[PDB]
Amino acid sequence: ELANYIAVIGLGGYYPGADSIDELWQNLANGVDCMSDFPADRWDHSKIYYKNRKVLGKTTCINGSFIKDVDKFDYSYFKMPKVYADHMSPEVRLFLQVAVHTFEDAGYSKETLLSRYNGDVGVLLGTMSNDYHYYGFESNVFRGSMASGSGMATIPMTVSYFYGLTGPSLFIDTMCSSSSTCIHTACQMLKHDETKMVLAGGLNLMYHPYTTVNTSQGNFTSITSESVNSYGVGADGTVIGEGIGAVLLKRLDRAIADRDQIYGVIKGSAMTNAGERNGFNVPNPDLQTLAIRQAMDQAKVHPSSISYIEGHGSGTKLGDPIEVLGLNNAFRWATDDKQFCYLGSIKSNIGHLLAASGIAGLTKTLLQFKHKQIAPSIHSSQLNQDIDFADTPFVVPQQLIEWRQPERIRKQVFPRRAGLTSIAAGGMNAHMIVEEYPEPADSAGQISEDQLVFVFSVHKLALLAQNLTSFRDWLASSEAPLAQIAYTLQVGKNNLRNRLAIRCRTRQALSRALNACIDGHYQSSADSKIFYRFQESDAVQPLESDLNDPLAPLLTQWLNGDSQVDWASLYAQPPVRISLPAYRFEKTRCWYTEEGYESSIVNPLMFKNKLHPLVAKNCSTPQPGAIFRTDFVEDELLDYVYSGRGGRRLSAFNFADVALAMPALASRFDGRTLSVSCAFEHYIADWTTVTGLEYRLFEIDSEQLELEFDFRRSGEQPTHLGFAVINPLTSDEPPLPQQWLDDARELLNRQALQAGRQLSAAEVSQRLAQAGYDFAPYLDHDGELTIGRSGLVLKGRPPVNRHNHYADNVQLSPYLATTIDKALYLLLDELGLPQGRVIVRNIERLCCYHTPAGGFSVVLSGIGLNDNELSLSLLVLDEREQICVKLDKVSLYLGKQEVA
Amino acid sequence: ELANYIAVIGLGGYYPGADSIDELWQNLANGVDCMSDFPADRWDHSKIYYKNRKVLGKTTCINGSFIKDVDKFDYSYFKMPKVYADHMSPEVRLFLQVAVHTFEDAGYSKETLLSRYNGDVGVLLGTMSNDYHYYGFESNVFRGSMASGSGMATIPMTVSYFYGLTGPSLFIDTMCSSSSTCIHTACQMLKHDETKMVLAGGLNLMYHPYTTVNTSQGNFTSITSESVNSYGVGADGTVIGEGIGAVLLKRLDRAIADRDQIYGVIKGSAMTNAGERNGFNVPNPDLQTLAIRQAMDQAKVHPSSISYIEGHGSGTKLGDPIEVLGLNNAFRWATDDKQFCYLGSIKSNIGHLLAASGIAGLTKTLLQFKHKQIAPSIHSSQLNQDIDFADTPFVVPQQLIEWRQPERIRKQVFPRRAGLTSIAAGGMNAHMIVEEYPEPADSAGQISEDQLVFVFSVHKLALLAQNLTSFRDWLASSEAPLAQIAYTLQVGKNNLRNRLAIRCRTRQALSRALNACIDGHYQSSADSKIFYRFQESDAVQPLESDLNDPLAPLLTQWLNGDSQVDWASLYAQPPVRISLPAYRFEKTRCWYTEEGYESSIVNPLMFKNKLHPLVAKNCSTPQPGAIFRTDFVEDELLDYVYSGRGGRRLSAFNFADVALAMPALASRFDGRTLSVSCAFEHYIADWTTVTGLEYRLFEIDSEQLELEFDFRRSGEQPTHLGFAVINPLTSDEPPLPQQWLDDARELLNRQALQAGRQLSAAEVSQRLAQAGYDFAPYLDHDGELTIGRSGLVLKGRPPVNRHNHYADNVQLSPYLATTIDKALYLLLDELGLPQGRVIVRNIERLCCYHTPAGGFSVVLSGIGLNDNELSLSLLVLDEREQICVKLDKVSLYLGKQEVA
């Protein structure tokens, strides 16, 4: 019956790429992919992102949907100190703002809630992520600091406290079905008179990088898809998105009597759980079809009537076919008709908002009701091949289309009906049935045009023009009756200290009066009388008393600050509430940390407690010389350590990088190009057993440093690995030998002529794979290999995402050092040693002029095979043909097995 | 009229100091204060505790109530890999165990839930803290490691998934009223047939030190009380405790029909929120009274009928009078009688369990119903003086008393009725009414005594004897009918793989049969036939089929593994369920970290990234000599930095501690007592301006080190602060001068005879306070001061809780160094310089023989005043009156004004 149903009288929230719900609709209607890359303001995602989950601590999330102003909060509006606002989680902060938008969207101000319900309004919401506490916790890991974050129940109770709501303030978490449960629970409390209204809501936010890491390790997000292709090309998972949704639910009969803006009518709501299963997340359409039919039976709606289904649309390859199968089953029992219902998902636009998925989906459906249009379900141009949509009621919309009331069945004009599906993890299948409620014919109400006052209030004057500008822009496009605007402003917008009243009888006067107010003039014109009290500035433009005008007292009370003003008395019939533009809050950054704060998740202490990735500590005794030690742990050195046939390998040239970083750690040779001459006495066949490298730096002269670096195994004493000599390059250094360029330049030019032998990156990877090399750890990218008459060139494009993004003293990068091993091995293969192991004895006069930025070309020329030694001159040419690393002679050691 | 009541058919949980709910009752009945100090297994609380909240990052929580086996989980029972068990939060793990206890306590096994409800059982729970994720996060702060913890919804859904429950699985968080709202929500769903049973529950756990840090900063826990004096002497706050509660709620009509163990009947439930208020936590007795009336009005119970009130009893001085005032108002409206109801709180026994406060309180009330006794509300022998209990219905019980049926108004024998009050943070004033359900006369049922089979199952055989031992011990004391035991074992205990059946006739037969099974003997005796099938060992002792016996088919089905065995057919009347001993799980440590893991919260990186609290890094160039630098930040050096009149001061003797620790940092002078001769060239009047200390250690000889320590201000260049010469003492050390002992021994003896001048610690504190000294940071503890003819003695007892508990190279502790400043000042005052500032120029031949542990006595002898110089020999005797620090000459600088 009418009283059984629950009407969504208000609707607001912060959704990606939408400054307001009207902006959200324009995005959905135009099919805007609000999915976006992680912004630099929060964190540099390139520092935490890796392509797959094998590298631990990184995130496989390529992108997402992000709501702007996650760190902005109007603590002054909500009567909170900034110190406490900073330490309050953004879930609490931003849901208060969404709470205001939802309550104001319904035309219910704090005064009206107290006036009419004494705050008997519930606030139910859910979120899977409240990760603000990490900020305070992480600081406490270093230095005792105030704990950050708020109790996860603080989100609804903060809304209840600010509004003084005496209804339930519950935090329900059912993971992805939080909003669906909160709306479902909200309905039950409203059907049973437990509450007058409920602010059902939900919110998912991604403002701490650990949220991406935790989400990535859940193995439920895509690692290749930048978008949620709902019912399109499937993916291994969904793509998470940000969003804060809130729908103000009131019993339908109340709303009609209260003359509220019924966005829609929730006739049915079914929750079905999987039960016994061989896995926590085991999709079962039989449970989906039961939920779909349970809601429809509860809503008493035939399947033929449903003309929209806001399906889960997670974009998963397996999930989507199952979802349509569940919906298809729930519809075939009644109708054999095909392609009459429209199946879409907001996830196609803004991704999987998790706890806000249901609220976000309902928001899409309600806006479609309001605009009588079915927004396109984007990213479904190429429909899923596992779904036969020609054999289902569902045609996934690709263009914005008017939502005709179905004429089918008989020939009856059923009202617009929709279904919200929430296939959440744990089998928590849910379904809702939403109908449009027809707009009352007498929505404008009745009020003498003289008694029309448009009342605007802000809590700071800096926001007055911003707020009035928003209203003026909306008023320009709005065709709503002036009485509706007046009433909603009067009984819908929170009465704030700075107040403004425009007494005008026509819309043009209101626009003209506003434009003066934005300009700060406030003069009372012939067509508009402007009164205001700016309690912030104690500036008054009062209203001359008139005994005849009923608006004189009410307006005098409102200006003077009386929160309870009986505005309804001015109206013979109270106008229905409408959706005025949302209050424009002050965008004050309320964050625990500073703007440039890179969390230790981005730069784990295995990186930022090291002077160099291979030189961790400086354990130097008072004796002459500097001693550094590093606790060699492979997981902390993934950029460096790769796998070969003998065992776990590490480029000998990484120790030329150490030599180049040493003068900085000795506070010597400031800003001078260095020449390094490394000689290795020992070869570590398997680096798995190496538990630490010990470095000893000395000063032979004023322009030379000797580095003797050793390695420790488990229990064994240190073993001498090699020694490096670091000498600066002067202005008198000779230019590079000409024949070396002649051979080097010929090798690169040979690629243009396609002479000699050339191997593609895939061929090189296959060629190196046969050798037993596994460069999975940030070293797998190979480049085109040219092999000329006097050497070979091996391209290399360092990955955008390396393991260690903190190090600033890595000049000969581990990728380049490994790319050199690839080049040297690929050279050893040509000479007839497919299984030969590279043994770098000498790196004689290595010189890196400027730190590489992009791709490079390792040129190995001047190859000579003496007795048990292979000598070659090595260059590393940037993509701009310039020499970046010059190396006169790499001397390799070839054993009897190789040569003989 | 009983269809609107909810019967608590099951009750289980892990409460402090209680291996079982029966043991919990014994604790409550005997008035056992289960409050205890934080165990060493989790963390060393002395490392994180501070007396007040001024020191940040520490916890003011002195103690709490802790449940044993927080890290133990039976992952094999719940079909989980240990990796999943380790990384899943203890809330999920332990509540999943409490779920089994609650379901088995109700006599519902997973099979009976599926057999009779298809799992249409709900699981609602709430917890204010889920702090497992920190373990994974903190590891990710250092090294990329797989994330820990579970979503807060994973607690109810994991129970739902394991048991295959199709009902609601919600996580409701209303902070301290989580259990009250979960039970209240459970009642609503059960009234409206939305579920067959609901496992209302809640849990608070403290297994990560940051939980205490976060709790301490909430400013809602006592910083001086070891206990929660519910309705006794108040405190500034409550004392949090651990606990996992769960009540299996079913409608009264169904429970009677199902013949369940109705612990109590929730007749009424009311929740009233505060609304408008001048503060989030603003107590309002009027709204408490409304909740009490609402529950009583809902339950149709006159106030005179209630004979117990399980009030909040948080022990707060403000809260308790308000609570009793609220309850007094709710009762004095009808009855003017005084001292007829009994007011208690489980918090007095186990503290404030936050989310489990309501469930814990209900558990107490339900146990009192079963045992018909009102357990004492301990810690209330001295009733709160702000409460007039003579003018109140409530007498806070002090001893265990029988709960006689109230014969009040007319004169009628009312049933045992109790009230549960939950005053949670915010305004969540919730009240509940619980009545006793009479035990049915025909509880034993009717089963032919030859058809008695006692069926025991375990998922491991190692637990079989442990489980049977528990049952045998319980069976020895239990008078319950054999049929009740048989039925509950049959339809109440999960049918685990290893199965045992004792087909006995009498209770003594069962005990003899059991004792054989505990001993490993399973031979069928004359009075008992034992049958079993063990999947773990594939060991079978089947039963010869008897077509006449109707128990042969059911028993064969059970032994063969058939989960669905129709045991009820054996009973002419199904016996009522009883509470068998809880399943004894396997105590496998499933923890993310290893034993002894001190979280960075305990040892923040400001401590364990420092080689010495004042010597942080080793930024040493290859040149001769070792260079150390420290980023001087006062908050990271609270142990060291105190306040004086000029500014923020630091003991010059702290730099003798550095000298004693550098030979270790030079890898020199191993195990040798060192002699330090510090000479300070500059005095830092205010240490607030110091931004870093730079140390330089040199090697004058093979048995001597030269230390030059500097300090840099904000922007200024380094300034020479002093130089220390560190020598090793040899076996040829001369004995200490005798006249020094004469003065040293003489000064100490004066305290015994109260000779000379003696000042108590309070007098010393006042004396130093007048000088402007504020040793607030771990330096305020003063000791008795003795003043003799030839010096003064200043006792000092280092606080148990210092700032830096990681440092192991602090030998001359900052407290002892500061104590010397107190001793030296008190010497300056003696000479007539109350405003004199200590300028320690030389610390000559300082020698700390052994690192002190406890209290000490700074003896200042041989005082001599020269031109602008005060010389005095300083000892530091320990509590055993043996020299610990020797110091030949402290040389102070006195300005011309000081001298005259």
Side-chain angles (χ1 to χ4, degrees), chain A residues 513-524 530 532 541:
Chain A
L514 285 153
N515 280 304
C517 295
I518 294 90
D519 292 331
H521 286 127
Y522 302 140
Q523 270 84 351
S524 299
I530 292 155
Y532 65 83
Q541 187 169 250

Side-chain angles (χ1 to χ4, degrees), chain A residues 56 133 141-142 146-147 153 157 166-167 169 171 173-174 192 194 210 217 273 604-606 618 620 622 625 697 699, chain B residues 56 133 141-142 146-147 153 157 166-167 171 173 175 188 192 210 217 273 428 604-606 618 620 622 625 666 697 699:
Chain A
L56 211 49
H133 47 65
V141 162
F142 310 80
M146 294 299 291
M157 299 186 168
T166 61
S169 64
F171 177 89
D173 185 356
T174 68
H192 309 135
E194 313 197 50
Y210 193 70
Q217 296 189 18
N273 297 32
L605 291 155
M606 64 190 178
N618 183 352
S620 68
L697 188 153
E699 293 177 353
Chain B
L56 186 63
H133 47 66
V141 161
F142 296 83
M146 183 179 72
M157 293 180 183
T166 300
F171 176 87
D173 185 359
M175 305 190 285
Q188 295 298 109
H192 318 311
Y210 192 70
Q217 298 187 18
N273 296 132
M428 283 279 182
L605 294 164
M606 62 190 180
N618 184 354
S620 181
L697 188 153
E699 301 180 355

Side-chain angles (χ1 to χ4, degrees), chain B residues 374-652:
Chain B
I374 296 169
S377 191
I378 57 165
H379 295 325
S380 61
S381 56
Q382 183 62 255
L383 308 157
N384 190 358
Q385 293 177 335
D386 287 34
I387 293 184
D388 202 346
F389 280 113
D391 186 74
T392 310
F394 318 125
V395 65
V396 181
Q398 316 303 154
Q399 70 276 17
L400 182 77
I401 61 171
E402 293 82 3
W403 189 347
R404 185 179 296 113
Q405 295 275 329
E407 61 86 20
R408 308 184 191 96
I409 61 170
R410 283 83 56 80
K411 301 293 103 180
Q412 185 178 3
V413 192
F414 281 117
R416 295 185 178 82
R417 287 163 181 168
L420 277 296
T421 312
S422 180
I423 297 141
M428 283 279 182
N429 297 295
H431 199 70
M432 194 180 312
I433 297 287
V434 185
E435 198 198 0
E436 65 170 342
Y437 189 77
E439 183 178 1
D442 56 2
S443 308
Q446 291 294 323
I447 190 167
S448 64
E449 183 178 1
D450 54 31
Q451 293 177 335
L452 278 170
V453 67
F454 297 80
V455 298
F456 309 87
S457 67
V458 290
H459 87 273
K460 293 182 183 293
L461 281 167
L463 316 171
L464 181 59
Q466 176 182 11
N467 272 270
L468 292 178
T469 301
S470 187
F471 180 84
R472 186 262 296 163
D473 300 353
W474 174 84
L475 185 81
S477 71
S478 188
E479 182 65 26
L482 279 297
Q484 289 212 268
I485 304 168
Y487 194 58
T488 310
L489 277 165
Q490 284 161 9
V491 302
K493 310 293 269 182
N494 297 172
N495 300 310
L496 294 174
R497 60 184 184 177
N498 308 294
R499 303 191 174 191
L500 175 63
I502 308 164
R503 199 179 173 288
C504 74
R505 191 107 57 192
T506 65
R507 181 187 311 278
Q508 45 278 30
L510 187 55
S511 300
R512 286 183 270 264
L514 286 155
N515 285 311
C517 296
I518 294 90
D519 300 338
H521 304 346
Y522 300 126
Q523 306 69 51
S524 301
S525 65
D527 59 356
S528 55
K529 300 294 187 291
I530 291 155
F531 310 117
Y532 64 86
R533 214 193 65 100
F534 299 150
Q535 288 71 351
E536 190 168 56
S537 85
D538 213 324
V540 65
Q541 180 175 69
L543 74 165
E544 276 72 26
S545 176
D546 300 334
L547 288 166
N548 203 351
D549 193 359
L551 170 72
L554 299 171
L555 200 42
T556 299
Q557 288 180 15
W558 194 71
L559 295 175
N560 296 12
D562 292 288
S563 280
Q564 295 292 325
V565 188
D566 177 56
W567 285 113
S569 56
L570 295 174
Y571 301 83
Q573 194 189 30
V576 177
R577 274 65 174 269
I578 71 177
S579 309
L580 306 172
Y583 188 76
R584 305 289 298 281
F585 290 115
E586 183 178 1
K587 301 291 180 67
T588 58
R589 179 195 162 73
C590 304
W591 210 251
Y592 182 89
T593 67
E594 56 289 350
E595 294 293 328
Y597 168 84
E598 294 293 328
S599 173
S600 296
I601 306 309
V602 183
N603 301 313
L605 294 164
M606 62 190 180
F607 301 153
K608 66 183 182 181
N609 280 331
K610 286 200 197 141
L611 315 169
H612 186 266
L614 293 171
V615 194
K617 296 183 290 294
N618 184 354
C619 295
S620 181
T621 75
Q623 293 177 335
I627 298 155
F628 303 81
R629 292 182 179 92
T630 179
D631 281 15
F632 191 94
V633 182
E634 300 199 341
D635 291 346
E636 315 212 321
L637 295 183
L638 289 174
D639 274 331
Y640 287 86
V641 183
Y642 64 90
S643 289
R645 186 179 295 276
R648 206 90 167 164
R649 270 153 173 51
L650 182 142
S651 178

Side-chain angles (χ1 to χ4, degrees), chain B residues 8-13 20-22 97-109 163 199 246-248 259-263 363 366-367 370 474 488 491-494 576-583:
Chain B
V8 188
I9 55 153
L11 169 48
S20 60
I21 292 286
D22 265 343
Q97 298 187 337
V98 165
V100 168
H101 297 334
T102 306
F103 282 117
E104 292 190 349
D105 176 57
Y108 289 87
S109 52
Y163 264 98
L199 184 87
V247 292
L248 190 63
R259 304 250 299 190
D260 279 279
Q261 172 179 211
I262 297 156
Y263 289 61
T363 296
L366 293 169
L367 294 170
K370 182 185 281 186
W474 174 84
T488 310
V491 302
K493 310 293 269 182
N494 297 172
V576 177
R577 274 65 174 269
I578 71 177
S579 309
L580 306 172
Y583 188 76

Side-chain angles (χ1 to χ4, degrees), chain A residues 579-600:
Chain A
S579 309
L580 303 173
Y583 185 81
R584 298 297 281 310
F585 290 115
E586 194 184 3
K587 299 291 180 68
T588 58
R589 184 198 166 73
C590 303
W591 212 250
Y592 183 88
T593 75
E594 295 82 3
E595 286 184 353
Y597 181 75
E598 293 292 328
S599 176
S600 292

